[PDB]
Design a protein around this motif. Structure first.
Motif, PDB file in Angstrom:
ATOM      1  N   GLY A  58       0.775  -1.225   0.000  1.00 43.91           N
ATOM      2  CA  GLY A  58       0.000   0.000   0.000  1.00 43.91           C
ATOM      3  C   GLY A  58       0.810   1.281   0.000  1.00 43.91           C
ATOM      4  N   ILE A  59       2.031   1.235   0.514  1.00 46.62           N
ATOM      5  CA  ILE A  59       2.833   2.452   0.529  1.00 46.62           C
ATOM      6  C   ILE A  59       3.329   2.805  -0.873  1.00 46.62           C
ATOM      7  CG2 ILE A  59       3.464   2.022   2.934  1.00 46.62           C
ATOM      8  CD1 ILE A  59       6.415   1.757   1.676  1.00 46.62           C
ATOM      9  N   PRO A  60       3.482   4.109  -1.140  1.00 49.65           N
ATOM     10  CA  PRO A  60       3.976   4.555  -2.444  1.00 49.65           C
ATOM     11  C   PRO A  60       5.381   4.014  -2.700  1.00 49.65           C
ATOM     12  CG  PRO A  60       3.024   6.384  -1.219  1.00 49.65           C
ATOM     13  CD  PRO A  60       3.125   5.240  -0.264  1.00 49.65           C
ATOM     14  N   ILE A  61       5.665   3.608  -3.933  1.00 53.63           N
ATOM     15  CA  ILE A  61       7.002   3.137  -4.272  1.00 53.63           C
ATOM     16  C   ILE A  61       8.013   4.209  -3.891  1.00 53.63           C
ATOM     17  CG2 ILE A  61       8.599   2.564  -6.108  1.00 53.63           C
ATOM     18  CD1 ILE A  61       6.158   1.518  -7.690  1.00 53.63           C
ATOM     19  N   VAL A  62       7.676   5.452  -4.221  1.00 55.92           N
ATOM     20  CA  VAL A  62       8.512   6.586  -3.850  1.00 55.92           C
ATOM     21  C   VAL A  62       8.961   6.474  -2.404  1.00 55.92           C
ATOM     22  CG1 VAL A  62       8.567   9.057  -3.427  1.00 55.92           C
ATOM     23  CG2 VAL A  62       7.541   8.156  -5.538  1.00 55.92           C
ATOM     24  N   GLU A  63       8.006   6.314  -1.493  1.00 52.24           N
ATOM     25  CA  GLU A  63       8.332   6.157  -0.078  1.00 52.24           C
ATOM     26  C   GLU A  63       9.090   4.867   0.238  1.00 52.24           C
ATOM     27  OE1 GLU A  63       8.664   7.514   2.646  1.00 52.24           O
ATOM     28  OE2 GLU A  63       7.994   9.509   2.005  1.00 52.24           O
ATOM     29  N   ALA A  64       8.744   3.779  -0.443  1.00 55.14           N
ATOM     30  CA  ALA A  64       9.398   2.499  -0.197  1.00 55.14           C
ATOM     31  C   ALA A  64      10.900   2.631  -0.405  1.00 55.14           C
ATOM     32  CB  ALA A  64       8.838   1.435  -1.121  1.00 55.14           C
ATOM     33  N   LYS A  65      11.286   3.225  -1.525  1.00 55.96           N
ATOM     34  CA  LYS A  65      12.701   3.375  -1.848  1.00 55.96           C
ATOM     35  C   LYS A  65      13.425   4.270  -0.846  1.00 55.96           C
ATOM     36  CE  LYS A  65      12.842   2.197  -6.677  1.00 55.96           C
ATOM     37  NZ  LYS A  65      13.029   2.694  -8.067  1.00 55.96           N
ATOM     38  N   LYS A  66      12.835   5.423  -0.545  1.00 52.62           N
ATOM     39  CA  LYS A  66      13.358   6.268   0.524  1.00 52.62           C
ATOM     40  C   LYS A  66      13.560   5.414   1.757  1.00 52.62           C
ATOM     41  CE  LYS A  66      11.611  10.886  -0.596  1.00 52.62           C
ATOM     42  NZ  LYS A  66      10.843  10.608  -1.843  1.00 52.62           N
ATOM     43  N   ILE A  67      12.616   4.512   1.989  1.00 54.53           N
ATOM     44  CA  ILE A  67      12.653   3.675   3.174  1.00 54.53           C
ATOM     45  C   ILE A  67      13.694   2.560   3.054  1.00 54.53           C
ATOM     46  CG2 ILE A  67      11.313   2.000   4.544  1.00 54.53           C
ATOM     47  CD1 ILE A  67       8.808   3.815   3.832  1.00 54.53           C
ATOM     48  N   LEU A  68      13.740   1.911   1.894  1.00 50.66           N
ATOM     49  CA  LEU A  68      14.540   0.708   1.705  1.00 50.66           C
ATOM     50  C   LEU A  68      15.092   0.761   0.292  1.00 50.66           C
ATOM     51  CD1 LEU A  68      13.397  -2.984   1.924  1.00 50.66           C
ATOM     52  CD2 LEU A  68      15.609  -1.990   2.512  1.00 50.66           C
ATOM     53  N   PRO A  69      16.121   1.597   0.069  1.00 51.98           N
ATOM     54  CA  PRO A  69      16.618   1.800  -1.298  1.00 51.98           C
ATOM     55  C   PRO A  69      17.238   0.500  -1.807  1.00 51.98           C
ATOM     56  CG  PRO A  69      17.825   3.149   0.352  1.00 51.98           C
ATOM     57  CD  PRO A  69      17.056   2.098   1.088  1.00 51.98           C
ATOM     58  N   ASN A  70      17.755  -0.238  -0.841  1.00 49.72           N
ATOM     59  CA  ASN A  70      18.464  -1.492  -0.979  1.00 49.72           C
ATOM     60  C   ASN A  70      17.659  -2.708  -1.509  1.00 49.72           C
ATOM     61  OD1 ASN A  70      20.843  -3.177  -0.183  1.00 49.72           O
ATOM     62  ND2 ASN A  70      19.336  -4.009   1.267  1.00 49.72           N
ATOM     63  N   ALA A  71      16.335  -2.605  -1.548  1.00 49.71           N
ATOM     64  CA  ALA A  71      15.505  -3.746  -1.956  1.00 49.71           C
ATOM     65  C   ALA A  71      15.518  -3.987  -3.467  1.00 49.71           C
ATOM     66  CB  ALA A  71      14.073  -3.559  -1.465  1.00 49.71           C
ATOM     67  N   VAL A  72      15.052  -5.164  -3.881  1.00 54.14           N
ATOM     68  CA  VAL A  72      14.824  -5.439  -5.295  1.00 54.14           C
ATOM     69  C   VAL A  72      13.382  -5.100  -5.633  1.00 54.14           C
ATOM     70  CG1 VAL A  72      14.908  -7.152  -7.126  1.00 54.14           C
ATOM     71  CG2 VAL A  72      16.414  -7.374  -5.095  1.00 54.14           C
ATOM     72  N   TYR A  73      13.194  -4.105  -6.490  1.00 54.03           N
ATOM     73  CA  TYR A  73      11.859  -3.635  -6.850  1.00 54.03           C
ATOM     74  C   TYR A  73      11.414  -4.209  -8.184  1.00 54.03           C
ATOM     75  CZ  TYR A  73      12.131  -0.502  -2.867  1.00 54.03           C
ATOM     76  OH  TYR A  73      12.234   0.002  -1.587  1.00 54.03           O
ATOM     77  N   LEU A  74      10.287  -4.910  -8.177  1.00 55.37           N
ATOM     78  CA  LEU A  74       9.836  -5.631  -9.359  1.00 55.37           C
ATOM     79  C   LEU A  74       8.441  -5.188  -9.774  1.00 55.37           C
ATOM     80  CD1 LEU A  74      11.005  -9.197  -8.268  1.00 55.37           C
ATOM     81  CD2 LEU A  74      12.109  -7.802 -10.047  1.00 55.37           C
ATOM     82  N   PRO A  75       8.193  -5.128 -11.089  1.00 56.93           N
ATOM     83  CA  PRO A  75       6.870  -4.795 -11.619  1.00 56.93           C
ATOM     84  C   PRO A  75       5.908  -5.948 -11.390  1.00 56.93           C
ATOM     85  CG  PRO A  75       8.247  -5.591 -13.372  1.00 56.93           C
ATOM     86  CD  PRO A  75       9.143  -5.458 -12.163  1.00 56.93           C
ATOM     87  N   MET A  76       4.659  -5.638 -11.080  1.00 54.89           N
ATOM     88  CA  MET A  76       3.685  -6.693 -10.875  1.00 54.89           C
ATOM     89  C   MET A  76       3.459  -7.449 -12.180  1.00 54.89           C
ATOM     90  SD  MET A  76      -0.265  -6.573  -9.737  1.00 54.89           S
ATOM     91  CE  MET A  76      -0.247  -5.777  -8.146  1.00 54.89           C
ATOM     92  N   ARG A  77       3.570  -8.775 -12.129  1.00 56.03           N
ATOM     93  CA  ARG A  77       3.248  -9.615 -13.277  1.00 56.03           C
ATOM     94  C   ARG A  77       2.031 -10.481 -12.989  1.00 56.03           C
ATOM     95  NH1 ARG A  77       8.003 -13.044 -15.454  1.00 56.03           N
ATOM     96  NH2 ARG A  77       8.544 -13.249 -13.223  1.00 56.03           N
TER      97      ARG A  77
END
Ligand SMILES: Nc1nc2c(ncn2[C@@H]2O[C@H](COP(=O)(O)OP(=O)(O)OP(=O)(O)O)[C@@H](O)[C@H]2O)c(=O)[nH]1
Ligand SMILES: Nc1nc2c(ncn2[C@H]2C[C@H](O)[C@@H](COP(=O)(O)OP(=O)(O)OP(=O)(O)O)O2)c(=O)[nH]1
Ligand SMILES: [Ca+2]
Ligand SMILES: [Ca+2]
Ligand SMILES: [Ca+2]
Length: 341
Positions: A58-77
């Motif tokens: 539910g959180i904005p990707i924008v915020e997620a990255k600020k929060i956890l830049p280190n994660a692997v971010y994947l597009p929903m398939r």
DNA sequence: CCAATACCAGTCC
DNA sequence: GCGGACTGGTATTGGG
């Protein structure tokens, strides 16, 4: 009745881990990219590593990255997830004819006539978990109880990769002791209204007059909670018959231009008729979300079925009515079909 | 008319 | 605020 509920663990992200074992042990975040602008959109789900470091659905990707830049971010398939889901659901059908698919990652089985008690149910739950893991390499959580609501509560308590029985005496204890906010169907907004009425536990729902409760949360939710509190809830396990089916989409940009909007509307109609399959609607509603996020709808009910062709032409007329009667730009557009023959 | 219908805000997850 | 579906309160209206 003995009900067994299965809820797949961190489903979208877990599927991505299955497809890329290199991801395991890493924070994985599956995202819905909107493309109205850069990195717009929201987190669909994160694995348990990512949640450990503050990222959740539910959180904005924008915020997620600020929060956890280190994660692997994947597009929903979602198409890929749906295929895994469908195969798992077919696995579950083997354990009982009486099955209710609640969502892409949740299903209830009525195993009343498949096992004799909760010991055998637990055993079946382990068998189901093992089989899904063996065939799809997906971990799931199993909840078992005397009805759908407590089977789900059991899963909620045990996840992830868990199994839990809430037996008949524990149902009685929880009616007294469980925070009513933890009952399915009760979000934070409803929990707060109940707290104001003096209701913190299911049993408390009986301390108030029905009209006061129904006046606060509506008659449907009031009878639901009361049934649960009296331990009379016994809803059958079977796939729900939808009263409406439709699709509403966000447009790339706000518009009042009939032909900029039409393509989204028409795709909505196409996706709706695929979903509809053999069901024939008698009602159509064109639904718009305006730039400032209000909803406007115009509908028509016919004394007969609406084929896809009449859906196209009538939807145009209904959209024109919205644009005529509301001067704001539209942000989202779609359709809902109802009153099936 | 005013019961029937249409609209549409709120709610869940 | 990515979204499907359902609920139920309030506004509008059709009969012919
Ligand atoms: N909670 C939830 N939100 C969703 C889902 N699909 C799209 N959304 C988007 O998430 C938003 C929820 O946040 P709110 O701003 O409180 O509404 C919705 O507006 C939309 C979903 O399946 N569950
Ligand atoms: N696009 C989108 N998808 C969601 C959202 N919330 C849940 N989903 C989908 C993706 C998830 O894999 C699944 C979530 O259901 P759950 O509440 O059980 O969470 P999930 O399986 O991800 O994790 P969990 O059960 O807590 O281990 O449904 C959302 O807010 N937006
Ligand atoms: Ca779930
Ligand atoms: Ca899940
Ligand atoms: Ca809750």
């Amino acid at each position: 009745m003995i009900v067994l509920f299965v809820d797949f663990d961190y489903f979208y992200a877990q599927v991505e881990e299955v497809l890329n074992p290199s991801l395991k042990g890493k924070p994985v975040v599956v995202c819905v990219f909107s493309g109205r602008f850069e990195d717009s959109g929201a987190v669909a789900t994160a694995n348990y590593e990512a949640r450990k470091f503050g990222v959740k659905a539910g959180i904005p990707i924008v915020e997620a990255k600020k929060i956890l830049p280190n994660a692997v971010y994947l597009p929903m398939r979602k198409e890929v997830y749906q295929q895994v889901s469908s195969r798992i659901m077919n696995l579950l059908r083997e354990y009982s004819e009486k099955i209710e698919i609640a969502s892409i990652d949740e299903a209830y089985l009525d195993i009343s006539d498949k096992v004799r008690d909760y010991r055998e149910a637990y055993n079946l739950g382990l068998e189901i978990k093992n089989k899904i893991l063996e065939k799809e390499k997906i971990t799931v959580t199993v909840g078992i109880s005397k009805n759908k609501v407590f089977a789900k509560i059991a899963a909620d308590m045990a996840k992830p990769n868990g199994i839990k029985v809430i037996d008949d005496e524990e149902v009685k204890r929880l009616i007294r002791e469980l925070d009513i906010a933890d009952v399915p169907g009760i979000g934070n907004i409803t929990a707060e209204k109940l707290k104001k009425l003096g209701i913190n536990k299911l049993v408390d729902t009986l301390s108030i007059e029905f009209d006061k409760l129904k006046g606060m949360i509506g008659e449907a939710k009031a009878k639901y909670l009361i049934s649960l509190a009296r331990d009379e809830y016994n809803e059958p396990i079977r796939t729900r018959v939808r009263k409406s089916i439709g699709r509403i989409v966000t447009m790339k940009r706000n518009s009042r231009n009939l032909e900029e909007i039409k393509p989204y509307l028409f795709r909505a109609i196409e996706e709706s008729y695929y979903k509809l399959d053999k069901r024939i609607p008698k009602a159509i509603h064109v639904v718009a979300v305006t730039e400032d996020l209000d909803i406007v709808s115009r509908g028509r009910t016919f004394p007969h079925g609406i084929s896809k062709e009449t859906a196209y032409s009538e939807s145009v007329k209904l959209l024109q009515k919205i644009l005529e009667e509301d001067e704001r730009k539209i942000r989202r557009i779609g359709v809902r079909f109802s009153k099936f023959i």
